[PDB]
Amino acid sequence: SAVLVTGEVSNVDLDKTTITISEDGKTFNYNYEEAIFKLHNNVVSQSKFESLLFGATVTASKDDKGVLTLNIIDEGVDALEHH
């Protein structure tokens, strides 16, 4: 499960299910539609994940089969709180 990046979520687009993750001045973009979602390594639903996603710290990783996992390390807030 190669790690792609660990860092802060920005630019959350819930409609397009896309995020940007930033680490060390670099930006990584993901469509999380088909991702496995975790919260402190606990598997969770998309909805739960999105509820804590804005400004979250997330690790993005991919197994040998190309399946994307997005794990919230440090909790963000929901779309409505973010405003």
Residue numbers in the entry: 766 to 848
From the paper:
The S-layer is built from one or more (glyco)-protein subunits, S-layer proteins (SLPs), that self-assemble into a highly flexible and dynamic lattice through an entropy-driven process, allowing for structural adaptation in response to changing environmental conditions. In this study, we introduce the SymProFold pipeline, which utilizes the high accuracy of AlphaFold-Multimer predictions to derive symmetrical assemblies from protein sequences, specifically focusing on two-dimensional S-layer arrays and spherical viral capsids. The predicted models were validated using available experimental data at the cellular level, and additional crystal structures were obtained to confirm the symmetry and interfaces of several SymProFold assemblies.
High-resolution experimental data confirming the proposed assemblies at the atomic level is very scarce. Based on our predicted models of Viridibacillus arvi and Methanococcus voltae, we designed constructs (see Methods section) containing only the domain responsible for the formation of either the 4-fold or 2-fold axis. G Proposed assembly of Viridibacillus arvi (gray) with the 4-fold symmetry axis shown in orange. Aligning the crystal structures with the SymProFold models revealed a great similarity, with RMSD values of 0.65 Å for V. arvi and 1.38 Å for M. voltae, further confirming our predicted assemblies. The domains and residues in this layer might be important for interaction with the environment, including the host.
